[PDB]
Amino acid sequence: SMQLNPESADLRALAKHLYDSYIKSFPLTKAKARAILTGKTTDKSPFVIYDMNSLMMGEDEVAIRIFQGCQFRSVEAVQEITEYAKSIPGFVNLDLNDQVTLLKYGVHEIIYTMLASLMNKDGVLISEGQGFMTREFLKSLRKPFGDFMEPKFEFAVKFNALELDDSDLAIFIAVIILSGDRPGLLNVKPIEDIQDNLLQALELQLKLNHPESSQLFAKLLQKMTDLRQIVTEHVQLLQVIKKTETDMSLHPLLQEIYKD
Ligand SMILES: CCCCCC[C@@H](Sc1nc2ccc(NS(=O)(=O)c3ccc(Cl)cc3Cl)cc2s1)C(=O)O
């Protein structure tokens, strides 16, 4: 506890490595996002989709185009995340069918975690900061498509109140990926051993980075509960549309994950 020794040094090194890897794997960092969202960036201003009109001009059926755009991005997000996971010390030294498992059950949690970086009260940044689509507009979407992102915005405004930065999220995201309780893991003890290490790293990171804010570590770990709820409810809502809308197509790589 609050001791600058070899053990802590090693933990900071692990924080730094994770951070550096996160920057390399994740193009739109939270820091860039918040700049754009606060008008701080003197870089180019994004187009604001707030209605059907502004959706069209910006594009230069609706609900189904936007849904398919969310699934294409969902899939680049899985490539992004896969790369990161591989950078986590100990990850590639695991059974390739614990790697596939941790990523199968992990990706969606990470996706909604990081999506929060792109969100404020008003909406979400899209296409790497070139666009911004309003919360209320996503709601105005035809049923059932207007209920998908709503609960993410509810998650995001609470989560963003914690004021985590990329440093923090880097380690947090690792903690999630290495979750010791995903179905069908062969070698559970190694995964837990790495996560113990990450969890020490995160605790120390949070103490250093957040002097004013205590039980942040606690308050953060509880977010993993909210995340799993969100993913569950997301699947249930995807089950419905795959019934209601039995005419459109759902990318086959997501279907690989979703069915379990
Ligand atoms: C017209 C293009 C729309 C933007 C496409 C996605 C953006 S960012 C983004 N990325 C994801 C990733 C996942 C989700 N899942 S979700 O919130 O449950 C969701 C909300 C609404 C609809 Cl219609 C479908 C879905 Cl699945 C949403 C998003 S929004 C991008 O940069 O390309």
Instruction: Kindly report the CATH number assigned to the domain that includes residue 246.
Output: 1.10.565.10
Contact 155, 116 (CB under 8 A): yes
Query: Is the C-beta atom of 30 inside 6 A of ligand 1?
Result: no
Residue 180 is which amino acid?
G
What is the chain's alpha carbon radius of gyration, rounded to the nearest angstrom?
A: 19
Contact 25, 87 (CB under 8 A): yes
What is the number of structural domains in the chain? 1
What tokens appear for 68 in the block?
Answer: 């398919």
Q: In this structure, what are the phi and psi dihedrals at residue 124, rounded to the nearest 5 degrees?
A: -135, 140
For residue 23, give the 3-state DSSP assignment: helix
Full domain range(s) for residue 114: 1-260
Measured between alpha carbons, how far is 194 from 229 in angstroms, rounded to an integer? 25
**Residue set of the binding site:** 71-74, 108, 234, 258
Which contacts (CB < 8 Å, 24+ apart) does range 139-144 have? 140/51, 141/62, 141/63, 141/66, 142/61, 142/62, 142/63, 144/237, 144/240, 144/241, 144/244
| 209 HSE (CA, 13 A, CB side) | 19
Residue 12 is which amino acid?
R
Q: How far is the CA of 43 from the centre of ligand 1 (A)?
A: 24
Listed in sequence order, the residues at least 6 apart from 222 whose beta carbon sits closer than 8 Å to its beta carbon are none
Q: How far is the CA of 73 from the centre of ligand 1 (A)?
A: 7
Measured between alpha carbons, how far is 111 from 96 in angstroms, rounded to an integer? 22
Q: Tell me which residue has its CA closest to atom 17 in ligand 1.
A: 149
Query: Is the C-beta atom of 74 inside 6 A of ligand 1?
Result: yes
